[PDB]
Each structure stands twice: as C-alpha cells, then as structure tokens.
Design a protein around this ligand. Structure first.
Ligand SMILES: NC(=O)C1=CN([C@@H]2O[C@H](COP(=O)(O)OP(=O)(O)OC[C@H]3O[C@@H](n4cnc5c(N)ncnc54)[C@@H](OP(=O)(O)O)[C@@H]3O)[C@@H](O)[C@H]2O)C=CC1
Ligand SMILES: CCOC(=O)CCCOc1ccc(OC)c(Cc2cnc3nc(N)nc(N)c3c2C)c1
Length: 206
C-alpha cells in the first residue's frame, strides 16, 4: 500500500554535474525555470479535474527558493528533513525520508480525498537526489544540460549521462519527452544569458 507510483527526478546541471553554489543556482534562466514549472505542474486534461502533482525537496532547497515563491504554487510540496519541525509553513508538509513522504502522501491524498496525486517529482537537492537515485521506484530524470562548466560547490551524485551508467540510464527521443510532458518542447540548444542548454529525458527500467 505504498509503492503504486514511479518517481521522476527533475534537475538542471552542468556537463560537470554541477547543480548549485552558495545555496542557490549559479545561473539565472527564466525560460529554464518556466520549463521546470510547466513540467512539475502538467496533469493530463481528463485527470486534472482533481489531480495535483507533488514536489519533494530537501530542506536546503526549500530555503534556497526565494520566500516569494514558496510553497511552489499549484503543487503539493513536501520538505524532507531528519529533524521535525516545520520550516514555518502554511499547509506545509514535512517528512523524514523519501518513503515517509510517500506514506504521508498516500495517507493524506487517498481514494476518498478531494485532491488526488498525479505524478511525484524529486526536485533537489544533492542529498535528496542521492536518496532518489537509490530508490527502486525512480525511473526517470528530466535533465536540463547546461553546456558550461560553471563553478559550483554542490554536485549531482551519480554520473548518469556517462559511459559507466549507460546500460542502466538511456536518453529518450525528443518526441518521447514532448509526449511525456504533454507539450512541444524546444529541441536542441537554447541560449539565455551566454550559455547554451538543452532539455533531455533519461529513463531506467524498474
Ligand atoms: N540545479 C538544480 O536543478 C537544483 C539545484 N539545487 C541546489 O542544490 C543545493 C542543495 O543541495 P543539498 O545541499 O544536497 O541540499 P538538499 O536540498 O538535498 O537538503 C539537504 C538536507 O535536506 C534534508 N535531506 C535530504 N535528503 C534526505 C534524506 N534522504 N533523508 C532525510 N533528510 C534528507 C536535510 O535534512 P536535515 O534537516 O536533517 O539537515 C539535509 O541536510 C543548493 O545549491 C540548491 O540551490 C536544488 C534543487 C535543484
Ligand atoms: C514565477 C517563477 O517560478 C518559480 O517558482 C521559480 C522561482 C524560484 O527561483 C528559483 C531559485 C532557486 C532554485 O533552486 C532550488 C529554484 C528551484 C528550481 C529552479 N530550476 C529548476 N530547474 C530544473 N530543471 N530542475 C529543478 N529541480 C529546478 C528547481 C528546484 C528556483
């Protein structure tokens, strides 16, 4: 009664797997953020009469997001921390692990509940990505690849794009990405603020 849905990890990362610096993002990309918001918010039309997606994040990511933007609108937010607590929150879910979060969500958002869960996303940071990478239900990574070795002080924990991991993690066709996300997605390099980046989707068999 706990393992009824796959997890999807969503991340923007450099070719050196860098994801962060000074507890924030070391880039400023409005369209990249708009993609994150669209992907994490998208529910197919028939289902969206009551469906909401879930965003799971570590406490340091929670704090990283400008207070203006919290909780992340229109999604069920859960902050994962070893130390309960709160973080001061208006409706704001807390759990001590990825599986305690899932248990809390299934208990809270049941068959009878007016709000139902569509997809569940792990949205960072490195420590929670590490847990998700070890979780037997994670099967999908929505990666934005940033083609610049921007200096970072926190890194994605497993080199899923590299040869050593290439029998396990496979990059999907762009048409498959678009299908999964429910919309046209720009394909190939996008330039904002002096860097090229591009959207990818990678999967692992369960
Ligand atoms: N580029 C990208 O897409 C993203 C980048 N980032 C960046 O990542 C950096 C944050 O990464 P990181 O420092 O690893 O922080 P995280 O957000 O993963 O938070 C780490 C903390 O969250 C809790 N936590 C995480 N995993 C677990 C677990 N398995 N069980 C229990 N508690 C857990 C904290 O708990 P406790 O309260 O016990 O200390 C732990 O210290 C920042 O620079 C942020 O900007 C974040 C999201 C996306
Ligand atoms: C009205 C604007 O819509 C908004 O709500 C975004 C405003 C917040 O600005 C941010 C500053 C820092 C930050 O690091 C946590 C994030 C989170 C983020 C950004 N890109 C991201 N991009 C990807 N591919 N993946 C992520 N997981 C991600 C994540 C978590 C956002």
């Amino acid at each position: 009664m706990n393992q009824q849905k796959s997890l999807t990890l969503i991340v923007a990362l450099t070719t050196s797997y860098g994801i962060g610096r000074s507890n924030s993002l070391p880039w400023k990309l409005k369209k990249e953020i708009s993609y994150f918001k669209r992907v994490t918010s998208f529910v197919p039309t028939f289902d969206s009469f009551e469906s909401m997606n879930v965003v799971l994040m570590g406490r340091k990511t929670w704090e990283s997001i400008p207070l203006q933007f919290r909780p992340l609108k229109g999604r069920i937010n859960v902050v994962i921390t070893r130390n309960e607590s709160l973080d001061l929150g208006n409706g704001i879910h807390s759990a001590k692990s990825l599986d305690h979060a899932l248990e809390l969500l299934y208990r809270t958002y049941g068959s009878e509940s007016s709000v139902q869960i569509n997809r569940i996303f792990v949205i960072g940071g490195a420590q929670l990505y590490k847990a998700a990478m070890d979780h037997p239900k994670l099967d999908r990574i929505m990666a934005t690849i940033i083609y610049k070795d921007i200096h970072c002080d926190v890194f994605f924990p497993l080199k899923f794009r590299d040869k050593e991991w290439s029998s396990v993690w496979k990059k999907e066709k762009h048409s498959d990405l678009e299908s999964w996300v429910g919309t046209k997605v720009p394909h190939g390099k996008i330039n904002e603020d002096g860097f090229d980046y591009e959207f990818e989707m990678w999967t692992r068999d369960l």
